[PDB]
């Protein structure tokens, strides 16, 4: 089924119906007035961030054997992996761009819902996810609550509850134990038969929308267009 969409729910409603039970939801009317929503174009990103060095993941999926990480300027990333017919998929993923470039922080806001957590605002981790159509983050789970805010483009997102972990065949190794062995959109059902019947939620996340990903909820993400998302990891 689909992830529910709610317009600006009260803190108490979000707490009781979503945060405490650990249920995903899309929040509307919360981030649609970030300055980023109108300001962030490729040209703006080049002007504010183009000369800075960022880590770039190169390859279809971080679970691939050919996949690698490199360093380049934001201008180089845009030129090589977005605008010119790219030779490979590149992704500026999982990067604390707003600590690197404080000016961009003025264009976003931490959702007020984060104040319901038991952690300090100073410990909230804010990451940028910027890349072309077709980037894929394989199915994985994270150790904190997350608000994933879509600024540019759309993403297809599949969510599996922690209760379904046995059907998702987590990797055995330490570096990948938070990651599924299954390719969500083309699963090997001969090797991973339990995956076929595992229930899930899905959505297309569009600009101005926030997806709440409960702590430890398994999530898979594919960009459908040139995309920029901002995540807030909080407890």
């Amino acid at each position: 089924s689909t992830v529910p969409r709610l317009h600006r729910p009260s803190l108490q409603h979000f707490r009781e119906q979503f945060l405490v039970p650990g249920r995903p939801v899309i929040l509307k009317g919360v981030a649609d007035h970030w300055p980023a929503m109108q300001k962030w174009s490729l040209e703006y990103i080049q002007e504010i961030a183009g000369a800075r060095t960022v880590p770039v993941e190169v390859g279809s999926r971080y679970t691939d054997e050919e996949w690698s990480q490199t360093l380049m300027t934001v201008n180089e990333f845009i030129s090589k992996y977005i605008v010119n017919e790219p030779r490979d998929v590149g992704y500026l993923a999982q990067h604390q761009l707003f600590d690197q470039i404080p000016e961009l922080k003025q264009d976003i806001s931490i959702p007020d819902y984060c104040s319901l957590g038991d952690g300090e605002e100073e410990e909230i981790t804010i990451c940028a996810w910027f890349g072309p159509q077709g980037t894929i983050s394989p199915l994985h789970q994270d150790p904190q609550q997350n608000f994933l805010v879509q600024v540019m483009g759309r993403k297809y997102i599949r969510l599996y509850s922690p209760q379904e972990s046995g059907a998702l065949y987590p990797h055995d190794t330490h570096l990948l134990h938070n990651t599924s062995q299954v390719d969500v959109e083309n699963p090997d059902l001969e090797k991973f038969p339990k995956f076929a019947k595992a229930p899930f939620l899905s959505c297309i996340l569009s600009p101005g929308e926030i997806l709440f990903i409960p702590v430890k909820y398994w999530h898979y993400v594919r960009a459908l267009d040139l995309s920029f998302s901002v995540s807030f990891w909080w407890s």
Partner: peptide, 5 residues
Amino acid sequence: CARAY
């Protein structure tokens, strides 16, 4: 925020 370590 990493998933790739």
